[PDB]
Amino acid sequence: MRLIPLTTAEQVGKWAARHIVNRINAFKPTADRPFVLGLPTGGTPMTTYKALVEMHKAGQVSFKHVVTFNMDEYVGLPKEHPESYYSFMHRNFFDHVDIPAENINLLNGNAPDIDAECRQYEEKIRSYGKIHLFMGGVGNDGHIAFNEPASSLASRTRIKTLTHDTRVANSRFFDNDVNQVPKYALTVGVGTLLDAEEVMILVLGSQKALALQAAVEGCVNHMWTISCLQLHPKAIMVCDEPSTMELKVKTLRYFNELEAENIKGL
Amino acid sequence: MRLIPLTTAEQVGKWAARHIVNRINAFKPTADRPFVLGLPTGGTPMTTYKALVEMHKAGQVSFKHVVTFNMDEYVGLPKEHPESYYSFMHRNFFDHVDIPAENINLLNGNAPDIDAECRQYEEKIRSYGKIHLFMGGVGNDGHIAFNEPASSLASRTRIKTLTHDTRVANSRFFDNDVNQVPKYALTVGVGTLLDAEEVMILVLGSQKALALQAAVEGCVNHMWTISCLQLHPKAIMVCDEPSTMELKVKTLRYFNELEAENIKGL
Amino acid sequence: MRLIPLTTAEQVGKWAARHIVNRINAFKPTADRPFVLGLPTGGTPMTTYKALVEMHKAGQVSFKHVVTFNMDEYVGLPKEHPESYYSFMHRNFFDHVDIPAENINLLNGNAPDIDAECRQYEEKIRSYGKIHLFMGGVGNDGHIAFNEPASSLASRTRIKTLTHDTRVANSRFFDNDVNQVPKYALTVGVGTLLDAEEVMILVLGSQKALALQAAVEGCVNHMWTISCLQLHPKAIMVCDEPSTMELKVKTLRYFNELEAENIKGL
Amino acid sequence: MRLIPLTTAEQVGKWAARHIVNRINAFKPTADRPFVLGLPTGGTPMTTYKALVEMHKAGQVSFKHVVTFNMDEYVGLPKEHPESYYSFMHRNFFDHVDIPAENINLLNGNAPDIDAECRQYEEKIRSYGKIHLFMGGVGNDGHIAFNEPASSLASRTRIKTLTHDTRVANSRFFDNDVNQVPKYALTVGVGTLLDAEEVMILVLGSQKALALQAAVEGCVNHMWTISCLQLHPKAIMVCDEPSTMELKVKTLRYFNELEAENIKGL
Amino acid sequence: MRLIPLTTAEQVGKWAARHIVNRINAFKPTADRPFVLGLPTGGTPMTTYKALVEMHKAGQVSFKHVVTFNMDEYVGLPKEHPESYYSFMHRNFFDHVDIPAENINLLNGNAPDIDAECRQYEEKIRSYGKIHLFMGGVGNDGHIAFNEPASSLASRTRIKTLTHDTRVANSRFFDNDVNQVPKYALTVGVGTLLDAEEVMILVLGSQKALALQAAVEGCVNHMWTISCLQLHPKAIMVCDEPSTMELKVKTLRYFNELEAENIKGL
Amino acid sequence: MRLIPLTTAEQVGKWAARHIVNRINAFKPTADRPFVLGLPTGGTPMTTYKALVEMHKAGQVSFKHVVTFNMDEYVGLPKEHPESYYSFMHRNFFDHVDIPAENINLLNGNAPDIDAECRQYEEKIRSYGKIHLFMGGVGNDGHIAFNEPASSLASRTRIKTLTHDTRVANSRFFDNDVNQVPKYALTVGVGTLLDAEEVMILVLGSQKALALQAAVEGCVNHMWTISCLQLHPKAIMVCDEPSTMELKVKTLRYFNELEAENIKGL
Ligand SMILES: CC(=O)N[C@@H]1[C@@H](O)[C@H](O)[C@@H](COP(=O)(O)O)O[C@@H]1O
Ligand SMILES: CC(=O)N[C@@H]1[C@@H](O)[C@H](O)[C@@H](COP(=O)(O)O)O[C@@H]1O
Ligand SMILES: CC(=O)N[C@@H]1[C@@H](O)[C@H](O)[C@@H](COP(=O)(O)O)O[C@@H]1O
Ligand SMILES: CC(=O)N[C@@H]1[C@@H](O)[C@H](O)[C@@H](COP(=O)(O)O)O[C@@H]1O
Ligand SMILES: CC(=O)N[C@@H]1[C@@H](O)[C@H](O)[C@@H](COP(=O)(O)O)O[C@@H]1O
Ligand SMILES: CC(=O)N[C@@H]1[C@@H](O)[C@H](O)[C@@H](COP(=O)(O)O)O[C@@H]1O
């Protein structure tokens, strides 16, 4: 894997946005061949969405032929709720870019038949062929998407029960009221993510240091599902400074040597 | 994976038997489309076989269209020996249910050409397509079937040399005479097991606590082959109380929350 | 996996050479169906190449229908440099055996288009179908080929940046001048190696003890890429005495019991 | 050690306060033979101080002949400043009980000679003889007061440098401004603490779960200073529920069984 | 420490007995200056007691001036009861040697004041001065007598609660009925043991392999009490073959080389 | 502990030498009150001895009233022999400073009674009182002098057996012939070292990286004797850059911040 050792969240967002833009422009998407982009929500991707929107306004990128798939969504939460991932995505991205409504794909957390909703989501991805770039984040306990500890490393899209710690962490968005945080979520699986051509994970803060250590220096295991990246042929972790504190000196030294030239330029 | 935290061996057997029955009845097997069931031997599955037989006698299940494959068998041990897995299976299951003789598949530990015997076993499974549910147990040192420590995680059916500790453990069935325990066995491989649609492992006793910890909280590795379950899309571990002592409190708490409703009802 | 516990480097070379010879002669290669052999360089395979050459001179083996692929090569290093892997291979093997020039495949570390060179190398392997036996070694830090720490376990042939420690270790061949050691190399990937039918790794010296421990008793992880062997269906590690010092007593005992008969005979 | 597995911080405070009172009254302190109590600050001991104060108000305990020693203080900071441990101790405890000023001992951060003051503090403790009970908390990283990771396990009272993470954890009381949190502070040493007759550590919150695991199931090491308790003949850890989530099931089970009768009524 | 790598329990007993005799005769005890010997119970020391008794019968050693202290006893249990450590010690040792009753020290589980008795036991040891040699065993979980996991490494003689696993391990001598195995017992402490001039631990069986690994290669920690030996200036572990299986090859190799001449003739 | 993160061995030697001089001159030794200095041999302390000698030549320090004790020596080897620690100490230090012969203490490997000599060495140290500063190095496996893995953490001066790896590591000075490297040697103990008022360990080279990690981030254990420093109230590790590569980023970051002003000018 590649690990981009940056300093601030601002830099991480600019780097991630530029990488997405560069992939899209080199791909040259069309109506017959769209660029498929996987997306996450949360506080981590905020600076990236900001940079992407700016780049679009400047005419540096167009999403007219970009199809998106989000990694997850809360179950039972009204779609119109400000904290639903649907709301998050339109507010921070879709509302501001030229992406067609038919090109947007989100999991329906209120679908009557849960397994059916998830199965059709996988079918939708299959209709296109593959996700060219899936961007995501990592949980304090190492989850990728909502693939909580003890989730199959070959899992597909399905419903999952969030850990109490994940609910506490996410309660920051529900007025610090853990009881308002949904208990279940629909999430793409580890296998679903591994099927993507390229995976780019954003990592910010000291709160993510242990998870970054697990992803980079730890072993492949289903407790810290982010470790699945070790099995992916093209994974990139874009990190800020605080997030790298638990890595070994030689490890960070190596990544700094590799990316010295690829980090200076914004 | 799913982990069913039960209390006694009796409960484990009733839960496992019910799961098998439910899978079969929902599948609706026929002569053109049989339900393929993988089976284990040993002291662990005893209460499960007992429950299955009871359920059959009550007309709750029929094996007329169920095809079985056992995971292993001792090499060189006369088929008529009471401790051969062939004898174990007929005595505790086949003799008591309506399963056709042509539907039963067992490895011949006395075959003249070992590799040939194993190859044909894999071919037999392939003739059906796939094993819909493979039930098994776990060794004190973490083996699944007889895939002893340092067995390929992509192994196929083959002959294996048992560890001295495995022979000592199994000597309980040979009048506590380790020298009477066969040194070799034919066993389906880790890859063979991973090809099954669903894997259900029964775990009983304090003697299995370290192996359960390895399977659940440990890393993927070939020393404790049971760790392969982390790579399987549909694995279930059915455990008694003593077997969960080495897990973290938060881990058992999570599984208890998930299965609270699925455990009460027998 | 199989682990052959031998005593000296001489024995390791004789055992590895015999295994290669036996595989080739049983295969019976022809112009329509050649035997594809993957090869390494370095100080480790020296006694093996010596034994192979001797066996060829004695008429025990012919390479007329053997196609070879080397695992790596230094980038930017003149092909004519005595320490290039190209030079190493001709000097220690090709110059002494009846293998056709068209049957030899080596990565061109001075190719103008790096990704293109690597892609065509993979295509060349694909043209044959598969590598029947890939022989290699292991780095002090556990690398297989030049798949340095944090290399994808599903990687393909590509350019890699060597770790400072790898350069120091290899400096022994550049007059102990680390600054003369190339910084980059083209190397087959972990996935490339996993696609081989059989992988045989030679392990010599106390300097490799920690790497052997990682490969055998450690977990699957991308830091010690040699751990990928746990995912391979047919891997063999041929070791000398010093290299086994970090293994557990029971582990070495098991391998000694398994190979007792397969080690005496040269 | 003893570990008291309680549910809430309210229960922890009541248990800890009762223990202090029990020890004080059994000792029956006098002017010539005072009971010496070591004390901590921060949010952790809040429920204990409140409970202890109410016990005093009800006439169950008197501090007329109780001498106290606090574990730390800021250097060069005006004692009057609210963000001083002096201010904390008076506001939350001393202001509300009958302890004489001459019986209160706090490190003077404004001492003319630091190394002289710290020496004097140790001298003062020996002047009485020993601290009969030292109450404390534990940091997220396992620290005790200012004995940060890598502090000698035989350290005495001295000046110390705070970790960046510790400053961030305490910035909460500094208007979330880390720039206001002191970088140094006078603190009793690990050896100083170990010399106490009994040590009682309060553990509250999920943020302390890893530290508790290190203290209870980890090895003795100076990175997690709390591990020092394993070397003490009379240590007690009073915990709430979330702080115990990282412990093994059998560990928590053991302490629950042992203290079942000692936590009734809370 | 010294580790004596022997093969059978018979050899272990002969080596340990000879060591005790060697120490006793070199000391040359008298009425005013007795040799103080600490002793254990259970199945582990059986071959040692038998060998020691035969050495006495042959006139190679006398216990006329040897004072003994046993590590533990049950509380509130009639001394007369066969399942008492008093009964064990007499039946397997005292009944057969010339030690005077006044020289025998066993904790009185029927003491009117437990905390008073334990204190008296420590007092008795100091009355002589010190224990010159303390022989013991090790539990499957690393315990020593009743110093179960999480016992202070500086503990003194006191009352203690047995783990459920310990009770199960000893239920063998209680008709396999755990309900008959006492839940408590008076036991010397880890500190008590460390105060002995020399400590010799007997290690027998595969069931002790993990404990031996913890004692020899693990870190100092109170979960595996046997790790305390690393803090003692004169400790010796006398082991049989199966108990050494979890150690590293280099570890066992080291002790074999060191004691090669010291184990000849057994 | 304090860890001084320097870059080169030249800087390490200058820092360590200056520290020794600072301590000596602050102490102001006299005939009746000498400064006692513990010393090591090998390649590690070379830059320190050279720097110390130049400081003496410049008149910044005198050894007229400095008494020295070296950590070890070979047994039965002629003191005259060049490959003796006596010869090393004089050639690299004593020959160049004004220390009187009567102030030099080295273990006599040719003592008529070894156990008597070692006892005498400890006696000599106590005759002065204590060693004020003991300088040492660390072995690749964490050893200190001859306190090889599995040496008691409370060991005194005694005779010891070297590990095979230690002999190989030192064979460099023995014409690369391990057969010339002694198998035994008289050495001060871990307890002996811990009794010193201050301990300063020099750490140089990538070969010491794992040992440094064990000393700083590992747990107290007798396999890595250097871990004993965690139990000492005044330990200092002076390191070069490559020796710190296995430490965590946050660990090195902490020491760099702490010693930033203390390493300026080197
Ligand atoms: C309601 C709910 O939470 N259901 C999930 C199920 O969807 C998931 O498949 C399984 C764990 O398995 P996995 O993570 O390995 O798929 O756990 C639970 O049964
Ligand atoms: C007689 C016998 O025991 N043969 C087995 C072989 O069948 C197995 O393939 C290999 C280990 O490899 P695996 O577990 O990775 O297949 O070990 C031994 O050679
Ligand atoms: C010039 C160079 O060193 N390029 C390599 C690239 O080829 C490799 O793919 C990646 C790590 O990823 P991998 O080991 O997972 O492929 O690192 C670097 O970008
Ligand atoms: C100004 C300052 O911060 N001084 C401290 C010193 O007092 C302490 O002794 C040492 C760490 O060692 P310790 O924690 O092992 O004492 O670090 C620093 O030198
Ligand atoms: C009745 C009983 O079981 N009392 C013991 C006590 O004697 C012991 O001191 C403590 C554990 O601490 P220790 O093992 O560290 O002494 O546990 C229990 O309180
Ligand atoms: C001749 C010889 O090598 N004797 C040493 C002995 O002096 C040492 O005490 C012990 C290990 O124990 P220690 O390192 O814990 O003292 O090993 C050997 O018996």
Coordinates of all heavy atoms in Angstrom, one line a residue, chain D residues 190-229:
Chain D
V190 N 6.9 7.0 41.2 CA 6.4 5.7 41.3 C 6.8 5.0 42.6 O 6.1 4.3 43.2 CB 6.8 4.8 40.1 CG1 6.2 3.4 40.2 CG2 6.3 5.5 38.8
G191 N 8.1 5.2 42.9 CA 8.7 4.6 44.1 C 8.0 5.2 45.3 O 7.7 4.6 46.3
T192 N 7.7 6.5 45.2 CA 7.0 7.3 46.3 C 5.6 6.6 46.6 O 5.3 6.4 47.7 CB 6.8 8.7 45.9 OG1 8.0 9.3 45.4 CG2 6.3 9.6 47.1
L193 N 4.9 6.3 45.5 CA 3.6 5.7 45.6 C 3.7 4.3 46.1 O 2.9 3.9 47.0 CB 3.0 5.7 44.2 CG 2.5 7.1 43.7 CD1 2.4 7.2 42.2 CD2 1.2 7.4 44.4
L194 N 4.7 3.5 45.6 CA 4.8 2.2 46.1 C 5.2 2.1 47.6 O 5.0 1.0 48.2 CB 5.9 1.4 45.3 CG 5.5 1.1 43.8 CD1 6.7 0.6 43.0 CD2 4.4 0.1 43.8
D195 N 5.7 3.1 48.1 CA 6.1 3.1 49.6 C 4.9 3.3 50.5 O 5.0 3.1 51.7 CB 7.1 4.2 49.9 CG 8.5 3.8 49.5 OD1 8.8 2.6 49.4 OD2 9.3 4.8 49.3
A196 N 3.7 3.6 49.9 CA 2.5 3.8 50.7 C 2.1 2.4 51.2 O 2.3 1.4 50.5 CB 1.4 4.4 49.8
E197 N 1.4 2.3 52.3 CA 0.9 1.1 52.9 C -0.1 0.4 52.0 O -0.2 -0.8 51.9 CB 0.4 1.3 54.3 CG -0.1 0.1 55.0 CD -0.6 0.3 56.4 OE1 -0.3 1.4 56.9 OE2 -1.2 -0.6 57.0
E198 N -1.0 1.2 51.4 CA -2.1 0.8 50.6 C -2.3 1.8 49.5 O -2.2 3.0 49.7 CB -3.3 0.6 51.4 CG -4.6 0.2 50.6 CD -5.8 -0.1 51.5 OE1 -5.9 0.6 52.5 OE2 -6.5 -1.0 51.2
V199 N -2.6 1.3 48.3 CA -2.9 2.2 47.1 C -4.2 1.8 46.5 O -4.5 0.7 46.2 CB -1.8 2.0 46.0 CG1 -2.1 2.9 44.8 CG2 -0.4 2.3 46.6
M200 N -5.1 2.8 46.4 CA -6.4 2.6 45.8 C -6.6 3.5 44.6 O -6.5 4.7 44.7 CB -7.5 3.0 46.9 CG -8.9 2.9 46.3 SD -10.1 3.1 47.6 CE -10.0 4.9 47.8
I201 N -6.7 2.9 43.4 CA -6.9 3.6 42.2 C -8.3 3.5 41.7 O -8.9 2.5 41.6 CB -5.9 3.0 41.1 CG1 -4.5 3.0 41.6 CG2 -6.1 3.8 39.8 CD1 -3.9 4.4 41.9
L202 N -8.8 4.7 41.3 CA -10.2 4.8 40.8 C -10.1 4.8 39.3 O -9.3 5.5 38.7 CB -10.8 6.2 41.2 CG -11.5 6.4 42.6 CD1 -10.9 5.5 43.6 CD2 -11.5 7.8 42.9
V203 N -10.9 4.0 38.6 CA -10.9 3.8 37.2 C -12.3 4.1 36.6 O -13.2 3.3 36.8 CB -10.4 2.4 36.8 CG1 -10.1 2.4 35.2 CG2 -9.2 2.0 37.5
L204 N -12.4 5.1 35.8 CA -13.7 5.5 35.3 C -13.7 5.8 33.8 O -12.9 6.6 33.3 CB -14.3 6.7 36.0 CG -14.5 6.6 37.5 CD1 -14.9 8.0 38.0 CD2 -15.6 5.6 37.8
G205 N -14.7 5.2 33.0 CA -14.8 5.5 31.6 C -14.2 4.6 30.6 O -13.2 3.9 30.9
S206 N -14.7 4.5 29.4 CA -14.2 3.7 28.4 C -12.8 4.1 28.0 O -12.0 3.4 27.4 CB -15.2 3.7 27.2 OG -15.3 5.1 26.7
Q207 N -12.5 5.4 28.2 CA -11.2 6.0 27.9 C -10.1 5.3 28.7 O -8.9 5.5 28.4 CB -11.2 7.5 28.0 CG -11.8 8.0 29.3 CD -13.3 8.3 29.2 OE1 -14.1 7.3 29.0 NE2 -13.7 9.5 29.3
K208 N -10.5 4.7 29.8 CA -9.5 4.1 30.7 C -9.4 2.5 30.5 O -8.6 1.9 31.2 CB -9.8 4.4 32.1 CG -9.9 5.9 32.5 CD -8.7 6.6 32.1 CE -8.8 8.1 32.4 NZ -8.9 8.4 33.8
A209 N -10.2 2.0 29.6 CA -10.3 0.6 29.4 C -8.9 -0.1 29.0 O -8.6 -1.1 29.5 CB -11.3 0.2 28.3
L210 N -8.2 0.5 28.1 CA -6.9 0.0 27.7 C -5.9 0.1 28.9 O -5.1 -0.8 29.1 CB -6.3 0.7 26.5 CG -7.0 0.3 25.2 CD1 -6.5 1.1 24.0 CD2 -6.9 -1.2 24.9
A211 N -6.0 1.2 29.7 CA -5.1 1.3 30.8 C -5.4 0.2 31.9 O -4.5 -0.3 32.5 CB -5.2 2.7 31.4
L212 N -6.7 -0.1 32.1 CA -7.1 -1.1 33.1 C -6.5 -2.4 32.6 O -6.0 -3.2 33.4 CB -8.6 -1.2 33.2 CG -9.3 -1.3 34.6 CD1 -10.5 -2.2 34.5 CD2 -8.3 -1.8 35.6
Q213 N -6.7 -2.7 31.3 CA -6.2 -4.0 30.8 C -4.7 -4.1 31.0 O -4.2 -5.2 31.4 CB -6.4 -4.0 29.3 CG -5.9 -5.3 28.6 CD -5.9 -5.2 27.1 OE1 -5.5 -4.2 26.5 NE2 -6.5 -6.2 26.4
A214 N -4.0 -3.0 30.8 CA -2.5 -3.0 31.0 C -2.2 -3.2 32.5 O -1.3 -4.0 32.9 CB -1.9 -1.7 30.6
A215 N -3.0 -2.6 33.4 CA -2.7 -2.7 34.8 C -3.0 -4.1 35.4 O -2.3 -4.6 36.2 CB -3.5 -1.7 35.6
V216 N -4.1 -4.7 34.9 CA -4.5 -6.0 35.3 C -4.0 -7.2 34.6 O -3.6 -8.2 35.2 CB -6.1 -6.1 35.3 CG1 -6.5 -7.5 35.8 CG2 -6.6 -5.0 36.2
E217 N -4.0 -7.2 33.3 CA -3.5 -8.3 32.5 C -2.2 -8.1 31.8 O -1.6 -9.1 31.3 CB -4.6 -8.7 31.5 CG -6.0 -8.9 32.1 CD -7.0 -9.2 31.0 OE1 -6.8 -8.9 29.8 OE2 -8.1 -9.8 31.4
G218 N -1.7 -6.9 31.8 CA -0.4 -6.6 31.1 C 0.8 -7.0 32.0 O 0.6 -7.5 33.1
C219 N 2.0 -6.7 31.5 CA 3.2 -7.0 32.2 C 3.7 -5.8 32.9 O 3.3 -4.7 32.6 CB 4.3 -7.6 31.3 SG 3.8 -9.2 30.6
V220 N 4.6 -5.9 33.9 CA 5.2 -4.8 34.5 C 6.1 -4.1 33.5 O 7.0 -4.7 32.9 CB 6.1 -5.2 35.7 CG1 7.0 -6.4 35.3 CG2 6.9 -4.1 36.3
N221 N 5.9 -2.8 33.3 CA 6.6 -2.0 32.3 C 6.5 -0.6 32.6 O 5.5 -0.1 33.1 CB 6.2 -2.4 30.9 CG 4.8 -1.7 30.6 OD1 4.8 -0.6 30.2 ND2 3.8 -2.5 30.8
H222 N 7.5 0.2 32.3 CA 7.4 1.7 32.6 C 6.6 2.5 31.5 O 6.5 3.7 31.7 CB 8.8 2.2 32.8 CG 9.6 2.3 31.5 ND1 10.8 3.0 31.5 CD2 9.4 1.8 30.3 CE1 11.3 3.0 30.2 NE2 10.5 2.2 29.5
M223 N 6.1 1.9 30.5 CA 5.4 2.6 29.5 C 4.0 2.8 30.1 O 3.3 3.9 29.8 CB 5.3 1.9 28.2 CG 6.6 2.0 27.3 SD 7.0 3.8 27.1 CE 5.9 4.2 25.7
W224 N 3.5 1.8 30.8 CA 2.2 1.9 31.4 C 2.5 1.9 32.9 O 2.5 0.8 33.6 CB 1.3 0.7 31.1 CG 0.9 0.6 29.6 CD1 1.7 0.1 28.6 CD2 -0.3 1.1 29.0 NE1 1.0 0.1 27.4 CE2 -0.2 0.8 27.6 CE3 -1.4 1.7 29.4 CZ2 -1.1 1.1 26.7 CZ3 -2.3 2.0 28.5 CH2 -2.2 1.7 27.2
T225 N 2.8 3.0 33.5 CA 3.1 3.2 34.9 C 2.2 2.5 35.9 O 2.6 2.0 36.9 CB 3.3 4.7 35.3 OG1 3.8 4.8 36.6 CG2 1.9 5.3 35.2
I226 N 0.9 2.4 35.5 CA -0.1 1.8 36.4 C 0.2 0.3 36.7 O -0.2 -0.3 37.6 CB -1.5 2.0 35.8 CG1 -2.6 1.4 36.8 CG2 -1.6 1.2 34.5 CD1 -2.7 2.3 38.1
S227 N 1.1 -0.3 35.8 CA 1.4 -1.7 36.0 C 2.2 -1.9 37.2 O 2.4 -3.0 37.7 CB 2.3 -2.2 34.8 OG 3.5 -1.5 34.7
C228 N 2.7 -0.8 37.8 CA 3.5 -0.9 39.1 C 2.7 -1.5 40.2 O 3.3 -2.1 41.1 CB 4.0 0.5 39.5 SG 2.7 1.6 40.2
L229 N 1.4 -1.4 40.2 CA 0.6 -2.0 41.2 C 0.8 -3.4 41.4 O 0.5 -4.0 42.5 CB -0.9 -1.7 40.9 CG -1.4 -0.2 40.8 CD1 -2.9 -0.2 40.6 CD2 -1.0 0.6 42.0

